Amino acid sequence: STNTTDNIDYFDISDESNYYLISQLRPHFSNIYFFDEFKRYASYHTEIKRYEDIHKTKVNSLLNEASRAIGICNRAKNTVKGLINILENPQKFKTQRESYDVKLRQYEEKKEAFRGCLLNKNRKNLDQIKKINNEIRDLLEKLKCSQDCQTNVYFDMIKIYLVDFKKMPYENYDTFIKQYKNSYLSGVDMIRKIEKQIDNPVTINAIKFTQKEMGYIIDRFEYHLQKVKHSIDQVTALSDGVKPKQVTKNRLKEYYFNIGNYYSIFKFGKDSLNMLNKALIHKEKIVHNLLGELFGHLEERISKLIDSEYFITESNNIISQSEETLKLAEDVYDKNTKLIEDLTLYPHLEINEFKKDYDNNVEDLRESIIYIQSYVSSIKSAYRYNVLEKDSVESKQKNIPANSNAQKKVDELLSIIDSISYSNFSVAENFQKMKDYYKEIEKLKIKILQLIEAIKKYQQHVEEL
Amino acid sequence: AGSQKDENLALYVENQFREFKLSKVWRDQHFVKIQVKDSAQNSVIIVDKNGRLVYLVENPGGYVAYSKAATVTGKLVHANFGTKKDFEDLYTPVNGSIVIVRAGKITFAEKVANAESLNAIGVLIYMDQTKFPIVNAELSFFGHAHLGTGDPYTPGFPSFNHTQF
Amino acid sequence: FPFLAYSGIPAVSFCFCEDTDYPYLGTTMDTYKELIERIPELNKVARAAAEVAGQ
Numbered sequence: 001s002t003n004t005t006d007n008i009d010y011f012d013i014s015d016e017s018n019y020y021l022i023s024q025l026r027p028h029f030s031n032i033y034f035f036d037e038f039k040r041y042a043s044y045h046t047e048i049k050r051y052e053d054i055h056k057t058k059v060n061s062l063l064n065e066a067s068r069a070i071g072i073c074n075r076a077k078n079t080v081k082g083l084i085n086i087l088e089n090p091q092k093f094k095t096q097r098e099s100y101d102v103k104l105r106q107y108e109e110k111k112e113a114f115r116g117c118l119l120n121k122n123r124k125n126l127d128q129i130k131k132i133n134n135e136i137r138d139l140l141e142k143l144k145c146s147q148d149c150q151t152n153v154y155f156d157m158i159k160i161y162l163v164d165f166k167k168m169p170y171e172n173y174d175t176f177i178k179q180y181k182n183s184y185l186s187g188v189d190m191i192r193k194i195e196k197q198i199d200n201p202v203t204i205n206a207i208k209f210t211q212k213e214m215g216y217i218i219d220r221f222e223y224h225l226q227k228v229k230h231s232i233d234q235v236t237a238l239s240d241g242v243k244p245k246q247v248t249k250n251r252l253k254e255y256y257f258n259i260g261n262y263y264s265i266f267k268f269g270k271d272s273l274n275m276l277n278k279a280l281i282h283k284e285k286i287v288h289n290l291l292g293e294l295f296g297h298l299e300e301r302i303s304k305l306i307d308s309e310y311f312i313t314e315s316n317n318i319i320s321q322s323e324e325t326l327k328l329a330e331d332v333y334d335k336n337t338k339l340i341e342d343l344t345l346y347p348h349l350e351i352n353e354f355k356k357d358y359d360n361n362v363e364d365l366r367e368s369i370i371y372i373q374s375y376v377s378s379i380k381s382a383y384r385y386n387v388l389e390k391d392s393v394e395s396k397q398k399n400i401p402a403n404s405n406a407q408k409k410v411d412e413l414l415s416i417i418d419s420i421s422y423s424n425f426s427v428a429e430n431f432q433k434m435k436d437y438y439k440e441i442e443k444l445k446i447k448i449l450q451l452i453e454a455i456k457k458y459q460q461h462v463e464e465l
Numbered sequence: 466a467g468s469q470k471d472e473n474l475a476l477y478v479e480n481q482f483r484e485f486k487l488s489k490v491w492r493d494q495h496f497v498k499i500q501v502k503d504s505a506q507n508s509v510i511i512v513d514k515n516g517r518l519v520y521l522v523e524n525p526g527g528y529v530a531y532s533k534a535a536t537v538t539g540k541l542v543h544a545n546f547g548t549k550k551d552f553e554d555l556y557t558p559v560n561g562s563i564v565i566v567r568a569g570k571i572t573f574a575e576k577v578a579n580a581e582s583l584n585a586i587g588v589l590i591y592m593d594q595t596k597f598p599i600v601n602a603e604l605s606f607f608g609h610a611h612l613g614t615g616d617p618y619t620p621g622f623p624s625f626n627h628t629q630f
Numbered sequence: 631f632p633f634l635a636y637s638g639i640p641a642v643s644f645c646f647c648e649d650t651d652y653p654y655l656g657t658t659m660d661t662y663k664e665l666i667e668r669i670p671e672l673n674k675v676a677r678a679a680a681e682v683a684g685q
């Protein structure tokens with residue numbers, strides 16, 4: 001299984017004026033593609049012959065010197081390589097002694113130290129690009145045509161250039177990045193909820209870091225794809241089109257320079273979209289193979305939340321105790337239920353203040369026993385309305401996708417933990433009712449014994465009379 | 466209302482209205498009087514004519530806002546919903562007797578208003594199965610009993626801290 | 631109601647409501663689990679209600 005990243009080169013830096021963007025793909029600038037468009041513009045005018053001699057020395061100096069300067073900033077790329085790989089895995093951070101918040105600051109310093117290297121070694125070459133651009137302007141000054149200039153090359157270069165537009169796929173990148181970004185924000189929302197239950201600090205730092213880099217690459221993907229779609233929109237917007245038979249020389253220079261730069265944006269865009277596409281798919285598969293170490297440390301948290309959070313082992317004891325109390329009371333009335341029939345047949349012919357005590361206590365005993373049976377029925381009814389809830393969460397934990405690919409199963413497990421969290425108040429107040437009815441079963445449990453004592457006093461006093 | 470979780474949710478929303486770049490976000494607080502449960506339980510409890518053996522039905526988890534702190538005994542008389550049409554359709558005289566009604570089709574406060582105009586003492590409100598089909602029979606709920614709206618201990622004028630209450 | 635009747639502001643309310651009213655509405659069992667049990671597609675209906683308030 002893949003736990004490391006091999007290709008790192010998606011880092012890029014722009015100038016302080018934001019005019020030029022450097023990339024780590026060749027030719028490291030957009031303007032070389034404009035120059036290769038300007039060759040195909042210079043082939044159609046016989047006036048500009050010296051461009052084919054000058055620009056060979058110029059752009060050979062630019063490509064050799066630019067690839068040279070990246071060759072100078074290779075060495076920081078190797079250290080940020082080792083820093084990503086050590087900081088990212090649990091095993092490599094396990095063999096590394098320093099803490100995680102310690103090493104991530106080293107990641108920051110080496111990161112902007114690396115991008116600072118790359119810009120600081122291209123600072124001169126930006127001025128070089130200014131100088132060559134002034135030479136293109138100077139050679140385009142030498143055109144003979146002063147006032148009535150076609151505008152026959154231009155309308156055709158929109159056609160041949162439009163074939164290069166129809167070659168590229170655009171829909172798959174848009175649908176891809178919208179689906180992917182949906183999965184990203186779902187993941188970042190998911191880790192915040194998942195880091196409160198589960199113990200381990202290492203894998204959770206790996207996933208938080210990889211989602212940070214994943215966020216960076218999503219940002220660059222949106223940027224380059226935006227410039228591609230804007231370039232295509234402007235060029236096809238010029239293909240309506242305004243049709244002069246003649247233009248000014250500086251107007252013609254503004255035209256060729258103009259949509260030549262749009263070729264530079266587009267051809268600079270395609271390979272960057274390819275590289276970032278590989279980057280998002282690879283980092284995605286790293287994150288899935290990181291959550292595969294987490295679900296087994298989550299499953300026992302579900303199986304720990306159920307048995308303790310539905311209050312089952314305590315409530316079953318309450319129903320057991322109240323059941324034994326009912327068997328105690330009906331056991332005592334089973335003992336003296338003949339003795340009442342001995343103590344009803346005598347007294348009915350005499351000084352009857354004494355029945356006012358007796359049938360009082362007998363009606364108290366009967367209605368007390370019926371009260372205890374009704375109490376037991378109430379508590380068991382509450383218990384059924386709790387165990388139905390527990391059974392339903394068991395039925396949701398039984399049925400899962402199997403066939404769950406990828407990370408959707410960890411979202412199912414977290415949804416089950418929320419399905420235990422949404423049902424706490426019902427079980428709390430229901431268990432409070434169970435406590436109340438058990439208390440009053442204790443009160444009738446002492447009252448019935450006082451009644452039996454009064455019945456015995458009745459018996460001996462009837463024996464006295 | 467007034468709990469700590471309300472104020473944490475209000476800080477979360479008042480953070481969101483800042484993060485969405487609204488033109489202006491503002492808070493407005495004021496002090497009101499609500500009614501909350503006491504530390505002692507409130508119960509409904511069957512009393513025999515003898516006064517000897519006393520049987521209880523429920524300690525309700527849910528309460529009614531703006532009720533009175535009292536305790537009473539007496540006859541119970543069913544009423545449909547507490548419409549005025551219901552109380553004038555009844556055969557049994559209403560007065561001096563606690564009533565029961567079913568929740569729904571009218572605000573709670575107009576049930577208690579009609580049962581107060583017909584000089585009754587007590588109101589118990591429940592949910593049958595026909596109007597409200599559920600499975601859990603041991604379930605409680607909540608309602609305000611104030612006819613009209615607003616904070617009732619300051620009617621007409623607002624409940625800021627300039628009124629000095 | 632206090633916007634329309636007390637203040638004088640035109641007020642509007644609306645609901646996608648089943649014929650019988652919602653059972654556990656002021657209740658301790660009002661929660662998202664049983665809500666998504668009642669309504670199996672909540673995202674589309676919330677999309678519709680936010681669309682109406684948008685109009």
Ligand SMILES: *[C@@H]1O[C@H](CO)[C@@H](O[C@@H]2O[C@H](CO)[C@@H](O)[C@H](O)[C@H]2NC(C)=O)[C@H](O)[C@H]1NC(C)=O
Nearest residue numbers: 467494495496497498624625626627628629630
């Ligand atoms: C606004 O009125 C409230 C209500 O009395 C004041 O809040 C109380 O202040 C007293 C004394 O400071 C304390 O008992 C508590 O801080 C508050 N009581 C309760 C029950 O919340 C508040 O001080 C008033 N505001 C101002 C600026 O005076």
Ligand SMILES: *[C@@H]1O[C@H](CO)[C@@H](O)[C@H](O)[C@H]1NC(C)=O
Nearest residue numbers: 540557558559560561562584
């Ligand atoms: C009011 O209630 C008492 C209950 O004792 C009843 O006797 C009386 O008749 C009632 N009043 C009227 C006017 O019916």
Ligand SMILES: [Ca+2]
Nearest residue numbers: 619622623624
């Ligand atoms: Ca007021």
